[PDB]
């Protein structure tokens, strides 16, 4: 059922790319702040969380318009397929 196959595969691909960007940013920031604590040999729990929050908020301010474009496109498309037979 090429229609069910398409809609089902695209749902998962969209989950993977919508979620990837915030987690990539968070991971890279995490690594750099973890390193800096080693070369400084200076340690605390809170600095990485503090920076990660800002990094993710900026990520959302920037990309969020595109999240809307992608979701609207998919939303229309699935309805048209569901009611396509008539």
């Amino acid at each position: 059922m090429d229609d069910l196959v398409f809609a089902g595969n695209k749902a998962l691909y969209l989950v993977l790319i919508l979620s990837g960007w915030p987690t990539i940013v968070a991971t890279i920031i995490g690594l750099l702040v973890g390193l800096f604590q080693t070369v400084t040999q200076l340690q605390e729990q809170t600095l990485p969380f503090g920076i990660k929050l800002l990094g993710v908020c900026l990520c959302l301010f920037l990309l969020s318009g595109w999240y809307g474009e992608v979701l609207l496109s998919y939303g229309r498309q699935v309805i048209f397929l569901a009611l396509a037979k008539g």
Binding site: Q45, T46, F49, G50
Partner: protein, 223 residues
């Protein structure tokens, strides 16, 4: 009563009233908004649904009463008696226009026309139009076409209002959870603390007053 069929029609309408109220009146909106408020505050049981619905019905009464009264005063006049079918039919038709106006003010015409063309079997139910030509379609449209459009048009509006009402509380939730992570108290569920903050926030805004007033003001205007 002076006519057995007039009597029958009156009783039938009286029997259908609750479905008309539930499907063609601002009650549709007010009913939904209060339940969304309760959800956004995060309360399961309280206030009771019949408390909220009672208030919603009282408020809707003010908005709709002027039309009911106008129609009653119009129909109770025995000042003319009718020569023929068409004379009667037109006399009745012209009485509903106070309601027909109110539905046409708030529905969205593209649906109304779509349904009109659909209950007629015309041109196999849907066909293209080369030309776009508007024919005082406001007076043509049947009530049986207007009613669904109004319903959908107003449900959507309710969802919109509920969206706006959620945002302030979402802020509170994320803020509490972040300051708890700053303290490192990672095990503790925010809902134990965030709820009272929401309560006092709503109490200080006096959300019930603002909300109730604004709802009415969308339909009426008052000094």
């Amino acid at each position: 009563m002076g006519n057995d069929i007039s009597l029958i029609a009156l009783l039938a309408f009286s029997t259908l009233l609750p479905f008309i109220i539930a499907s063609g009146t601002c009650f549709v909106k007010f009913s939904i908004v209060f339940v969304m408020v309760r959800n956004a505050l995060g309360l399961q049981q309280i206030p009771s649904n019949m408390t909220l619905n009672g208030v919603a019905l009282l408020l809707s009464m003010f908005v709709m009463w002027p039309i009911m009264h106008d129609a009653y005063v119009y129909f109770e006049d025995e000042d003319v008696t009718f020569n023929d079918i068409s004379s009667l039919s037109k006399h009745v038709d012209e009485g509903l226009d106070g309601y027909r106006d109110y539905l046409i003010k708030y529905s969205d015409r593209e649906l109304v026309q779509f349904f009109e063309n659909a209950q007629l079997k015309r041109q196999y139910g849907e066909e293209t139009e080369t030309v776009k030509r508007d024919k005082d379609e406001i007076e043509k449209p049947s009530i049986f076409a207007l009613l669904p459009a109004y319903a959908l048009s107003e449900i959507k509006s309710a969802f919109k209002i509920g969206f706006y009402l959620y945002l302030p509380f979402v802020v509170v939730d994320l803020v509490v959870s972040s300051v708890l992570l700053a303290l490192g108290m990672m095990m503790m569920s925010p809902v134990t603390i965030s709820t009272p903050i929401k309560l006092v926030l709503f109490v200080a805004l006096d959300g019930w007053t603002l909300l109730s007033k604004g709802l009415i003001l969308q339909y009426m205007d008052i000094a």
